[PDB]
Design a protein around this nucleic acid. Structure first.
Length: 315
RNA sequence: ACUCUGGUUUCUCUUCAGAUCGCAUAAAUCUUUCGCCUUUUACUAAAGAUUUCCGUGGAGAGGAACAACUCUGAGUCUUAACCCAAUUUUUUGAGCCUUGCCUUGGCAAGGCUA
């Protein structure tokens, strides 16, 4: 019945100036600074508090495909097209340590909320689990026929998952040095993954359809449908809305507990004359969900806020 | 002056040493700056953080070798020649009477002495 009065989401600010398409995005836990991985081979750091930037990081051999912010230490985990995934120490204005064992480019990375480990989605299809602070590794995650698109993990029951290009979303149980289950729900390769604040159901998406699965035991949740396009990313916020970024430039906001999405957002972020098909590669919800960082292939990061209006239509 | 207490070198194991410098203390890795450079290992020389070698120090525990050598804190740690006490204690002077209070017993006060 579309309950809980889904509020409309609108724009906040526009940002540009990057030398290449923005592959990844991340934010500080205290909303002090922001960072984005880009196609320009240099790790981008943008402080968005006033609309400003943060710092220009260099030394990545290729475009950074992912980054993470460690809660315990000021070390941002780095992952890029150079197959070298290196957590960076920012305390000295220089890196922490460079992880090894990835046979090909790392498509993703993640950090465990409790134990210290490094997760990676490696285009070799290998999802790297690493005991990290010791310079150690942990275990290698295999079984995906194609490359791993995404990676997610949690300190709860062995929820581990790696989105795979093979159309079967992978589920790993890491605790035993093992796996969890094979998810056949997605009919095509799933390029989207999300973790809802409800924490009950793991979220995922694919260009064919979006697959939400209620876990731990192998249960599912719901099949999100109605957005047909290549799905670049899926991000679930605390208000109950999950924005879905696409390579075509259509970001569809999601009402979830209502069973269907909260918006269909079609907007043109296109930069100056070079445009082509470039869409929004990634997006991030803020801590208070007052704005949404928009990272697009046009090298434009646009935060999104709302005008505080009544609206609340239905269909 | 009596008695109970009762010691030195070496070899291992387990902890601690972001230490007043572990006195004349070596080497490696990475983020960069630089040197020369035809690519690499080596390599020129500065910063920072990550470390290993030769060491080395403190505490506790387990051994042997001369150990019967000596230390130890205390415990009541029992001695006669000769000259001396006018500010501290063994050569050093107190008592009586009267009144009031207290159940008396007793206490307080004043006076008397030679």
């Amino acid at each position: 019945p579309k309950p809980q009065w889904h509020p409309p989401w609108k724009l906040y600010r526009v940002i540009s100036g990057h030398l290449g398409w923005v592959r990844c995005i991340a934010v500080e836990p205290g909303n002090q600074w922001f960072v984005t991985g880009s196609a320009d081979r240099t790790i981008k750091i943008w402080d968005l508090a006033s609309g400003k930037l943060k710092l220009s990081l260099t030394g990545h051999i290729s475009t950074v495909r992912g980054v993470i912010v460690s809660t315990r230490s000021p070390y941002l985990f780095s992952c890029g097209e150079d197959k070298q995934v290196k957590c960076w120490d920012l305390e000295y204005n220089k890196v922490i340590r460079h992880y090894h064992g990835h046979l090909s480019a790392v498509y993703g990375l993640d950090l465990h909320p409790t134990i210290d480990v490094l997760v990676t989605c490696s285009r070799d299809s290998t999802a790297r689990i690493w005991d990290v602070r010791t310079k150690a590794s942990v275990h290698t995650l295999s079984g995906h026929t194609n490359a791993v698109a995404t990676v997610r993990c949690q300190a709860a029951e062995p929820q581990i998952i790696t989105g795979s290009h093979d159309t079967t979303i992978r589920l790993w149980d890491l605790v035993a040095g093992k796996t969890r289950v094979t998810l056949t729900n997605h009919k095509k390769s799933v390029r989207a993954v999300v973790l809802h604040p409800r924490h009950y159901t793991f979220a995922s998406g694919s260009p064919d359809n979006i697959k939400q699965w209620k876990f731990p035991d192998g249960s599912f949740i719901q099949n999100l449908s109605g957005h047909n396009a290549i799905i670049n990313t899926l991000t679930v916020n605390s208000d109950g809305v999950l924005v879905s970024g696409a390579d075509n430039g259509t970001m569809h906001l999601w009402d979830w507990r209502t069973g269907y999405n909260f918006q269909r957002v079609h907007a043109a972020a296109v930069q100056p004359g070079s445009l082509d098909e470039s869409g929004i590669f990634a997006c991030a919800f803020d801590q208070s969900e007052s704005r949404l960082l928009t990272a697009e292939a046009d090298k434009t990061i646009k935060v999104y806020r709302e005008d505080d209006d009544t609206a609340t239509e239905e269909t």
